[PDB]
């Protein structure tokens, strides 16, 4: 089943090329991954940590940083931004 992103998540996915209004979780994760790489939000010395405190992604997820190794927490954060 497709999901519908809330307006701010949708803005972020659109900034990396997404064109739809509805997505699979696989597509949201992909785009979110592209976004973090493009804006260089990961620590280049400690790659599993994403520092989003001064970025839109911080506003979206409500956290200053997060770990890519904490899979359950990433999905929780994404889910709050889906209808």
């Amino acid at each position: 089943t497709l999901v519908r992103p809330k307006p701010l998540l949708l803005k972020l996915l659109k900034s990396v090329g997404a064109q739809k209004d509805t997505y699979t979780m696989k597509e949201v994760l992909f785009y979110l991954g592209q976004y973090i790489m493009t804006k260089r939000l990961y620590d280049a010395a400690q790659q599993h940590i994403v520092y989003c405190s001064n970025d839109l992604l911080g506003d979206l997820f409500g956290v200053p940083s997060f770990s890519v190794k904490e899979h359950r927490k990433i999905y929780t954060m994404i889910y709050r931004n889906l209808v």
């Binding site: 979780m25 994760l29 973090i36 790489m37 790659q47 599993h48 890519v68 899979h71």
Partner: peptide, 11 residues
Amino acid sequence: ETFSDLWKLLP
């Protein structure tokens, strides 16, 4: 451990 590799392990 690279971001790209590690992110691909989410699903």
